Amino acid sequence: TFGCTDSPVRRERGQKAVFCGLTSIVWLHRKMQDAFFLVVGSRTCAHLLQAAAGVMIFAEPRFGTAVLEEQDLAGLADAHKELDREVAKLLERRPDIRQLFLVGSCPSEVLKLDLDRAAERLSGLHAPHVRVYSYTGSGLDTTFTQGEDTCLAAMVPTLDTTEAAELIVVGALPDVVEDQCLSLLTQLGVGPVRMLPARRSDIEPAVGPNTRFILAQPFLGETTGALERRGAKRIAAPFPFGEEGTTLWLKAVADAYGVSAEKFEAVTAAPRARAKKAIAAHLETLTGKSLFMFPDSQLEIPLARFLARECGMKTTEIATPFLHKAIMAPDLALLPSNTALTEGQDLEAQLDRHEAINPDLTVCGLGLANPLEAKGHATKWAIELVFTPVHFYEQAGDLAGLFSRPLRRRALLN
Amino acid sequence: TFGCTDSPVRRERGQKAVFCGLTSIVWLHRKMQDAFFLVVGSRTCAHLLQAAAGVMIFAEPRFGTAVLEEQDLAGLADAHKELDREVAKLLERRPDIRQLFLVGSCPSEVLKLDLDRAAERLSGLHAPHVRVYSYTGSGLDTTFTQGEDTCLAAMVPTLDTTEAAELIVVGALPDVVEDQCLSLLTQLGVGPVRMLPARRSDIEPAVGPNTRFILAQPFLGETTGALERRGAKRIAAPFPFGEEGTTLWLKAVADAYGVSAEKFEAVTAAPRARAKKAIAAHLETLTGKSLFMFPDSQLEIPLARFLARECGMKTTEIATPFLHKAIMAPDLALLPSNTALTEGQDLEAQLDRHEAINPDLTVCGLGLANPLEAKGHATKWAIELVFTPVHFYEQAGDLAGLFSRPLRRRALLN
Amino acid sequence: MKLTLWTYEGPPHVGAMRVATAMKDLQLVLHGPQGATYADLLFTMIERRNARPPVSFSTFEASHMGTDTAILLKDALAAAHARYKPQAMAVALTCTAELLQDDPNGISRALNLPVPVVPLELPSYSRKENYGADETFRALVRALAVPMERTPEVTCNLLGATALGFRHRDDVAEVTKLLATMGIKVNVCAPLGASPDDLRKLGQAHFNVLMYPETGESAARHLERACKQPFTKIVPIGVGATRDFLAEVSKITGLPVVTDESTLRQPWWSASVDSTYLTGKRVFIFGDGTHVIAAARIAAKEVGFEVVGMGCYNREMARPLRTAAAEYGLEALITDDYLEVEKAIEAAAPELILGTQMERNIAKKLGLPCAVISAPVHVQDFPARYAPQMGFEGANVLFDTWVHPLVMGLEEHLLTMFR
Amino acid sequence: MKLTLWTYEGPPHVGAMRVATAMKDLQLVLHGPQGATYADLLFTMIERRNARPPVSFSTFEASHMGTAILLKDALAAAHARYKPQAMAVALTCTAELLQDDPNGISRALNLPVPVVPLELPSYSRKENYGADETFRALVRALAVPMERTPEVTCNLLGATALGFRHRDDVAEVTKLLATMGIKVNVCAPLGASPDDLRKLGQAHFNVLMYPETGESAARHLERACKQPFTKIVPIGVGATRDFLAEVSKITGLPVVTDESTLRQPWWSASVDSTYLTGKRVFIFGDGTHVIAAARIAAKEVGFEVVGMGCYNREMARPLRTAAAEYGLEALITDDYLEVEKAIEAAAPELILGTQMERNIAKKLGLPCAVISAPVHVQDFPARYAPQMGFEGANVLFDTWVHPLVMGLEEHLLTMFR
Ligand code: SF4
Ligand code: SF4
Structure with missing residues (x-):
């Protein structure tokens, strides 16, 4: 299943x-x-x-x-x-x-x-x-x-050339998220580790045949290619959303750096338990609810994965504007097998699909959100998910909050 | 006249x-x-x-x-x-x-x-x-x-007792005004000079049989009495409104302190020319306009004096809630002879006189201002003249401005 | 005695003036000292009135302490009649004249004038402004309302609209509309707009709309006993409470509920996607009993805020409010001391505060967003533009007023965060 | 090339959309790139609409350079799906650079309803032109000479979708025309269907509410339908009076006003307003709202008008003509840096303008009110908020005066610390 x-x-x-x-x-x-x-x-x-x-x-x-x-x-x-x-x-x-x-x-x-x-x-x-x-x-x-x-x-x-074996975390993340990330990895004993992009131009990472990189964001196909073109090697991992996503993300890195399960479960159990409890507050309104995701960001597959497995949502049609088979493989592996998967879209076609499906929650752009509400469907506008801190442990409960909220408000307004 | x-x-x-x-x-x-x-x-x-x-x-x-x-x-x-x-x-x-x-x-x-x-x-x-x-x-x-x-x-x-011959300016004035005053007097060579009230309790002035005081405000009958009861002597002077008022006020002090007409004209000519230029701006809409003043503050007689003599206004009925014959003597000396003077009031009676008079400008309380406007009369609410700096040289033009403004606004709104 | 800076309410005689100024062809005469005229300003300036209030003071002073004083109120009553020839008069005492010997009752009966003169009891050391208003209106009503034959048409009375009423002018306008939308025509509206002759004609209405409990309840009750007139218990502020009001009117008249909803945009606005982040926001609510109760229902049931505090300065509404606040799992805060409010808000500590010109200041001090929902209020909240709180445009107006300071807070937050 | 951060106006195709979304039973099809649908958001979000705009894009992309076929399916799909009374087709700025001809393509397809093509000079003109043109084009394509209605009736012209206070201005003008015996024939484009447009000819005259979005179509109606159109826009008590006078002349009907709720003249005459006198105001925005604002400021409230200008080229003449009467040289620009400079040079005490001026105002610690587009969600309110007619005046007074009393309030309050 x-x-x-x-x-x-x-x-x-x-x-x-x-x-x-x-x-x-x-x-x-x-x-x-x-x-x-x-x-x-x-x-x-x-x-x-x-x-x-x-x-x-x-x-x-x-x-x-x-x-x-x-x-x-x-x-x-x-x-x-x-x-x-x-x-x-x-x-x-x-x-x-x-x-x-x-x-x-x-x-x-x-x-x-x-x-x-x-x-x-x-x-x-x-x-x-x-x-x-x-x-x-x-x-x-x-x-x-x-x-x-x-x-x-x-x-x-x-980028500067180097021969040092270093880890690059690729993808612009919020500074609080970036820091939490940086901390955990230091605690696990992976080092030294640098972001692409860096906060300033003078401290951009170096790349070389011994560089390892892991992606924090799904939408980095091209960057993966250019990094591989320089000799660097990717760590496959599902994206760090939820407790499971983050642990699996961190584990992939630990494993590539030979960190004992000892040090791993030490560094990670506190943050994990915190993460799982934060999510429960939302389990209430979330479990059993069917989900639809229009294509906007490439974040939809891993977020559907987080919503199903950790919040008890039932997936419906999950659409992405682009689907990198290799990068998404970790997450596709954990997504419920019923899921109708879509790359690209034809708006009116997909809306007919939507109407027919009649989903409890719909993720979409602002141009679709209000029209859908007007016609009875609870929505959650996608664009919030690129500016709000959502990745890693401390933001996990907040993440699920982004999706509980509209349902709670629809419930409360009647 | x-x-x-x-x-x-x-x-x-x-x-x-x-x-x-x-x-x-x-x-x-x-x-x-x-x-x-x-x-x-x-x-x-x-x-x-x-x-x-x-x-x-x-x-x-x-x-x-x-x-x-x-x-x-x-x-x-x-x-x-x-x-x-x-x-x-x-x-x-x-x-x-x-x-x-x-x-x-x-x-x-x-x-x-x-x-x-x-x-x-x-x-x-x-x-x-x-x-x-x-x-x-x-x-x-x-x-x-x-x-x-x-x-x-x-x-x-x-107040502390002293035997030094000092000048006391009596009446709370704005700090702007108080300093202008203090400066001119030091420049005339009068000293030392203190205010009642003082800015802080620890620098209150002393009083003795050798103290001289002058009033900055007309409403100080009781304080005059208590000051005299301690042995102090009042400089009589009209109140320092307009160029005339201030000059005459300053002159009175200078006289009591025997300062040569040389030194007086020296210190005073610059600020005086400045003062009477500022008032000309307003002379345009002001000259020839009839003035009515309801009783509020005791400032009405000397203000009527300033309006008539320096801005060419015609007085009508000038009412004050209380009229100290001796203090107000200098200003009464300068008020136009036609002026119907009133102490106290009967509201309905005075309002009949007002209606009968049909004055171009009426000074009054907030409770009468709008009702009078409604009925066609231009008004200037009295209460502004206790908060706005109006005394002495630099404020003189501003002073005239307080009265010109409503007339120019009635003009402008049709 | 107790140290007092800010005060939510005036002395009761101010409430008296609120009834008189609201009326026409009625002169109030108040026995009081030279200086008592200061409230004149409130009507002239805040309500921006074009005539001095129909209120005259005996205006005694220091030298008058002697038999002179009874005589003074006599002249005062006399002069007001001679001069304005009003259809009816009222007479009562200032706080300082409450300490004097002169009886308003005995003195006006002595004078014996060709129109009624209603004496009023104003406990100026135990009651406040709203009491004053409720009692004066009650008194005037007892004095003039006669049992009468019901009009052929279905009609009602609007009861409790006064002078320094927060949004009374446009509330009267708005409730008139939604009653008309439903076949009901307004008989008389009092105190606001009525003359003593209109008050005589109260009996012929089928029922009473009690717009503002704190300035009309007493008179509504008299009319229930004396005129077999029932009166609305629900005040129509908020879409929901407006519905129920309409339901309540249906019960009373038998007429079906009919609504013109063509302009009602609040339900969609707050259903709208941009309203999602309003969900869960902690609101503190303070003001006058009636307005606070209404505001709470809109916050919880209509907009989706969490109501995190409720209180009022108005001791009269203590019961309705404790009743109401209980339903929110909240203990009512009954006080007239802005420092208790300041402390309660702090303990609460909300994200939005809904209250009074004082709470606008407390909010400012605390860097918090804020909207005004109830008297006392300044010039700005006696607006030139249409601005009710009742009925459908009420909802619309409320939504704009409350949301605005939140979007500004987010705006100023975000743009400071961008430097 | 011009370095550009802020823009007062969209590309013309957003103007087209503004006419389409304003109407009912009309489908707009725009040839443009995957991504061109971003304007959707303005209608659903700022105007808080409950339906996707009646606008569809061919949405071509990189792989497609080899596309006339795409516009054809797009036109086809919109008809099949929505069966509208009429359609309009045009090009986005990107597709302006392509070969495909909207005129040729739509006539090839030959559908059972009219399809109006539109010329949108995306490198020379902006939003308002877009709207004026689309509206004009639609009107030329449907307005027929007609017999005048038995009763006296008029058209409301130029009310569009992202119009600053169009909703409530329409409501308000309808009221004051009705208080004078005139009933509204059709209101366009706001609320109108293509079938309503065909019935324009039968009105006696036209109210041109918003010159920048309706003038063209009003002129067509003057030559094509012998319909005179009002030149005065009723914003401000005085301008509303003269508007009514103007209508009297046109219809022969006597001017009749319900002033029972007109509170602005008293408020301003009232004693409280005396310190408004002489207050220096800077006025910026869109030609129409600026001209009206200046008359209110000088002749009605008593401000000194210290600066006057607008971003829309199209109103530069009426504005220069008007500004001249204040001893003032009109500022025509769309560079918010030119405005910022002019404001500083004029040093006003109040600024009346747009969202941008709101911001400049804050940068310079100055009080400020908003009088015209472009505007944010806030200024598409739930409460009744016209600018026209008597309630308009009421509303205007409260909006302008409020930030002045607040300023005085902040000043004094911090001055007691
Ligand atoms: S009772 Fe108080 S407020 Fe009234 S005149 Fe006397 S001191 Fe003034
Ligand atoms: S023309 Fe510009 S804004 Fe439009 S889709 Fe292309 S890049 Fe985006």
């Missing part, structure tokens, strides 16, 4: 309701204190960033958009000279920035601006103080969190 | 619409940093302070009210024991207070509580840290600013 390794996944293509990778800039620039993300794109792009950033827009954030005007279209031009002038204007009024990201859009790609050549020339003109990279965040090639993936993967080639 | 010393003043008594002396505590505690003003009264009294303090009530101010309960009426036991308990409660909860004021109300006087005997016993019990005084602020005995007068007069008897 658990195991989904061999279940057919519906590869669906059609009308899609998802965010583009440009969105990733929103949480991402917070983590990387030295960085600035310059989107080369249209006013549409500017607008999206604005909508996606809500309050933040007023907090002078280290992202912006080089909005393409009429004459940047009209051929030839110095699309590149324009870009250069804006970049100089930018770097001057902002000398704190140490790494600059030319983030490509749909318009910029359809116009085929060579953002890579741009990043190259600009690295030249602004060394040594500033290093400039290039990566796509467009709707054409990127869904939401996938923008984190393309960013990190662009950084990988340029 | 100017001179009112001989004018018959209408002594009226009937329904009165004025604030009681308790109000004085509102501006007055701000100037005496050490002091606390405890009103022994009813909830009515508490409520009025509240209304009269508006926002200040929330700023932990240094006044309160021991509100009389049913048991405090009912005969002579513990009114004094109960008061004592509340005072002890108060002085411990507030050890910064060095002077405590038992302020008498209508209820406290009708009940015949001996607030004097109370002050004395309590000075005993709380020596040396706290000296406690008693004075009346009741509606029965005082109108509005007259509360300052009773307060000050209660302090006088207990």
